[PDB]
From a paper:
In this study, to demonstrate the utility of virtual screening with protein dynamics, MD simulations were performed on [name] [name] to obtain an ensemble of dominant binding sites with a high probability of existence. The structure of the binding site obtained through MD simulation revealed pockets in addition to the active site that was present in the initial structure. Using the obtained binding site structures, virtual screening of 4.8 million compounds by docking simulation, in vitro assays, and X-ray analysis was conducted, successfully identifying two hit compounds.
Residue numbers in the entry:
A (entry chain A): 10 to 18, 20 to 169, 183 to 237, 242 to 293
B (entry chain B): 5 to 170, 183 to 294
Write the structure that this text describes.
């Protein structure tokens, strides 16, 4: 058998050989597929949601180190962190390396994702049981609505709402979401960036990522003048810097340099 | 083999258990050549790709993305050179690199050698926007093996050598002038990290003073990432910061990918790979 991935945005398909199907069922919220890919390939275990791959053993370090560290290294002293989505635990694992982090909340709508990540991606999900984390099953929209002003230093969106994200951040707050591809959806990113800036964020900057197959991130600061393109707390000064396989300060700087057709985003 | 409405399947033997497929709208060419199997087709009009070129079942050019790897190859090499007057391109029968090279006012002549005359022929036909450079009076376009060509070239002929391909490295160093920049199509840091390190190491060894690997951001590559080894003949040259920034040259604003920030960014590698560049 072969898992086939397709996008409405057509005439193209990416196919992965299925070694063993590990989970395949709808959930309260979406279709969840987990499979062991060809042992001769690099991919390891693969997770898709509604047919779109979200996690592979092989590349997960990329998007988890970028979202975790681009945001937290852009913050003067991130103590309280919210993660919306992230039920696999990867961003949480990266967030929790930082010795400044006192507490992280994680809210994912789908408790089956977390359950299934516990069983099939222990390399990613081990962080869910960290004492500095509180993991909640529920809607992030509903969650941010019922959250006090000035609760978090950083909100990470790993999937009215953006007013509430702005509201729940402290004055020096960093918001970081999963952006669309500049190839696939330049139009969406332009719109998101304007949207976010208008709802109140002072600077919005798009960071690009290098994935083995195809993504990036919007990094949003509440206070202006702050150049998020240069690390405010370089990871190189921190004890875990050599533990990371993708992210460092040079990659952080490089990530905001956009091909010319997309530059006007930043 | 290929039919209209059928699917083009791209597989890679270094990466088993995956395939990237494209829906074929119109088969344009599908025959063996003297050297390779050339396959050209119009892809799904509702997709972004347009016309697609494959050699031995490996896609080499699409209308959508060609600007990336041609701008990266053309300008990273030429903006690292004080005065690129005479330019060699090995491979590149489609003319894409050549079109970028010739944007530069300092170029007097560019030689181009591609082993397969059918590639150039079929690029003139089905990718006019890439191959229009093949008719430029400042270009001499030749059918031949690049191995024999550089073997037969005098010492200190070229300011820049660009290897754009699907003992020889001794020759490239030899035929470059003292200020020479060599540039090649590099393998993926994902697929073949080791090849790049062995390659970078033997290039330096054969006698190039510095070697730096640049990364590109492509819309799709089912084999990881495509890169470029940018190599300096003279010592004390830093290819990672543009020697002649494109922002000063009248055609900068015509480029869709490359600029100085992209140039600098391209040499920042993922931590797992950074030892390649230091
Ligand atoms: C698996 S994670 C994939 C990203 C790479 N780590 C994506 C998660 O976002 C969750 N998600 C989607 N919408 C929401 C909302 N509205 N709230 C919380 N979590 C959400 C969804 O259940 C996935 O687990
Ligand atoms: C099409 S180009 C790759 C597309 C990026 N412009 C790859 C070309 O290299 C040629 N090639 C391969 N081997 C050689 C040799 N030995 N010499 C010259 N050209 C070569 C081959 O015919 C393609 O046209
Ligand atoms: C080679 O097949 C693959 C492999 C990985 C992904 C993937 N990893 C994260 C997310 C962006 N997509 C994919 O979509 C297809
Ligand atoms: C949509 O599927 C695609 C699209 C593009 C490529 C490609 N562009 C440059 C060359 C190296 N490969 C591909 O292989 C498959």
């Amino acid at each position: 058998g072969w898992f086939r991935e397709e996008n409405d945005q057509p005439g193209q398909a990416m196919s992965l050989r299925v070694e063993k199907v590990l989970y395949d069922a709808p959930t309260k919220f979406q279709h969840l597929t987990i499979f062991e890919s060809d042992p001769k390939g690099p991919w390891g275990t693969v997770m898709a949601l509604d047919g779109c791959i979200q996690v592979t053993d092989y590349d997960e370090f990329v998007y988890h180190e970028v979202l975790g560290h681009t945001s937290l290294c852009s913050h003067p002293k991130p103590e309280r962190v919210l993660i919306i989505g992230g039920g696999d635990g990867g961003v949480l694992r990266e967030v929790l390396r930082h010795g400044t982090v006192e507490h992280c909340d994680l809210v994912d709508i789908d408790g089956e994702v977390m359950e299934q990540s516990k069983q099939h991606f222990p390399q990613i999900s081990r962080s869910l049981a960290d004492p500095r984390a509180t993991v909640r099953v529920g809607d992030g929209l509903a969650f941010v609505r019922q959250t006090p002003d000035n609760t978090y230093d950083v909100v990470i969106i790993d999937t009215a709402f953006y007013k509430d994200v702005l509201r729940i951040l402290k004055p020096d707050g960093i918001c970081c979401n999963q952006g669309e591809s500049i190839w696939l959806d330049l139009e969406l990113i332009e719109k998101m960036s304007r949207f976010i800036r208008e709802t109140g964020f002072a600077s919005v900057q798009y960071a690009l990522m290098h994935v083995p197959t195809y993504i990036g991130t919007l990094v949003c600061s509440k206070k202006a003048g702050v150049d998020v393109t240069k690390p405010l707390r370089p990871v190189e000064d921190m004890p875990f810097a050599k533990d990371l396989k993708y992210y460092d300060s040079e990659m952080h700087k490089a990530s905001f340099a956009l091909p010319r057709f997309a530059r006007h985003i930043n």
